[PDB]
Amino acid sequence: NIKVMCRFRPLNESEVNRGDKYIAKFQGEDTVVIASKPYAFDRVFQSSTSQEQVYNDAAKKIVKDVLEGYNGTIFAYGQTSSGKTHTMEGKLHDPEGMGIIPRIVQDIFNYIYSMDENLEFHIKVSYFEIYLDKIRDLLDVSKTNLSVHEDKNRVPYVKGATERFVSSPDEVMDTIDEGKSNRHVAVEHSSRSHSIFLINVKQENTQTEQKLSGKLYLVDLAVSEKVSKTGAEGAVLDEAKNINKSLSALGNVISALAEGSTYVPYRDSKMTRILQDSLGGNARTTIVICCSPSSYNESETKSTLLFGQRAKTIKNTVSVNVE
Numbered sequence: 001n002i003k004v005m006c007r008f009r010p011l012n013e014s015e016v017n018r019g020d021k022y023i024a025k026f027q028g029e030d031t032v033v034i035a036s037k038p039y040a041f042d043r044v045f046q047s048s049t050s051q052e053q054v055y056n057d058a059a060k061k062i063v064k065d066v067l068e069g070y071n072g073t074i075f076a077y078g079q080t081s082s083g084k085t086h087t088m089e090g091k092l093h094d095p096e097g098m099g100i101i102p103r104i105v106q107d108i109f110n111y112i113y114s115m116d117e118n119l120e121f122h123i124k125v126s127y128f129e130i131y132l133d134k135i136r137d138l139l140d141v142s143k144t145n146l147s148v149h150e151d152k153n154r155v156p157y158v159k160g161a162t163e164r165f166v167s168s169p170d171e172v173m174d175t176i177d178e179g180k181s182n183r184h185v186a187v188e189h190s191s192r193s194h195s196i197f198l199i200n201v202k203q204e205n206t207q208t209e210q211k212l213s214g215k216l217y218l219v220d221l222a223v224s225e226k227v228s229k230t231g232a233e234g235a236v237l238d239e240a241k242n243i244n245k246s247l248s249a250l251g252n253v254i255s256a257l258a259e260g261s262t263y264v265p266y267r268d269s270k271m272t273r274i275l276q277d278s279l280g281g282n283a284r285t286t287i288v289i290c291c292s293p294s295s296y297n298e299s300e301t302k303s304t305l306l307f308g309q310r311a312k313t314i315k316n317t318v319s320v321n322v323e
Helices: 013-017 051-058 060-066 084-088 100-114 169-180 236-258 270-274 295-310
Strands: 002-008 024-027 031-034 037-040 043-045 072-077 119-131 134-137 148-150 156-158 164-166 194-205 210-220 284-291
Touching (some): 051 100, 100 194, 156 270
């Protein structure tokens, strides 16, 4: 129910014109070897794999489960130059170049418009980012330092988060763009905060009055970058420490859940408490890590593949010693 998938993008014009090199060798449908080290995941999409196949294998059943009242979460790790934007968003007005989010929204609205009036559907969306362990509402710039509470049951929720009713795919995309335009930015074109978007598909059969409320979280994870040449000058050293700790707490939670542990360390970070309701209960979670096959980004791809490995851990090693 918990899967880590790796998506490689095709090289760019500039990458081939400047003589970049292919460093990824694919074996099976789940192993990619770089330099000499192999990395095995639940699925390794090669560059020749279409966007529709990536969606069908990573997000389709999550959408179907949310449409049945269940919860699901999808993460995205990787720099913008590794193809994360192409994988998750892509060319919107291209039915073949569409990313995961447009296909999610299209499926949700098509399903809703397939049903009859006996079901009353209401789609609500939220959008907030976690920057330096501060929850900032992206649909309301006056709301910063939001708090996490527990309602009746010990189910964490972000108090006061903005919830908007959406009624068309274009409205959802407008909401996403508006939320992206309200991030921190600070001192480029990088990911220095976790962006959590919510699609709350609620429904009610009007005679039974039995309500279902599925939550689908689309998370844009902050990326651990290489050590910058300039150190204690601005906020980059604080972003580094926060990104490291939050990605580790997320790794411990995904690993614990994947191993069926009863001691899931939810309370170690904000994001794993906000997502505690959608990660437990055997809800499907997919972590898409996006990588570049070019040698100019060999360092980044090593970091991205390691993070995908630390989401479910390994177990190995063996040396001989004398006496």
